[PDB]
């Protein structure tokens, strides 16, 4: 799995904060919240990136991958969150969007694969 590194400060066994800015219009990235790993503890789901295109706010952000793990959103822990709160936070009135990004090691979590062939 040829993986090129961008910055040493960025590893796969640590958490790195990700700051963003308010965007406009819809149609863009998508956040998946469908859990199935440990659905034993209701009210405590998690959020992850499902789709993402190059040149998008999340793109220029610096670095993102389909599966990223957000631990905190502008100070909103994954402690019981509605399905309309996250989105609202993405465009919240806040001045800036500061969230924590976590990227565990390869094996802990599965790999997301959306439609599209390969060649």
């Amino acid at each position: 799995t040829p993986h090129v590194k961008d910055y040493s400060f960025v590893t796969e066994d640590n958490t790195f904060e990700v700051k963003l800015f308010k965007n406009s219009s819809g149609l863009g990235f998508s956040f998946s919240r469908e859990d199935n790993l440990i659905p034993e503890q209701i009210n405590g789901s998690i959020v992850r990136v499902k789709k993402l295109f190059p040149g998008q706010p999340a793109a220029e952000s610096g670095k993102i991958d389909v599966g990223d793990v957000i631990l905190k959103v502008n100070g909103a822990p994954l402690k019981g969150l509605s399905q309309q709160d996250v989105i609202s936070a993405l465009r919240g009135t806040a001045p800036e969007v500061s969230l924590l990004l976590c990227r565990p090691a390869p094996g802990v979590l599965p790999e997301i694969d959306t439609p599209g062939n390969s060649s």
Partner: peptide, 12 residues
């Protein structure tokens, strides 16, 4: 089992 509770379909 072949069922759920809530779903999602919102993006930006």
């Amino acid at each position: 089992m072949f069922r759920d509770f809530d779903y999602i379909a919102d993006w930006c």
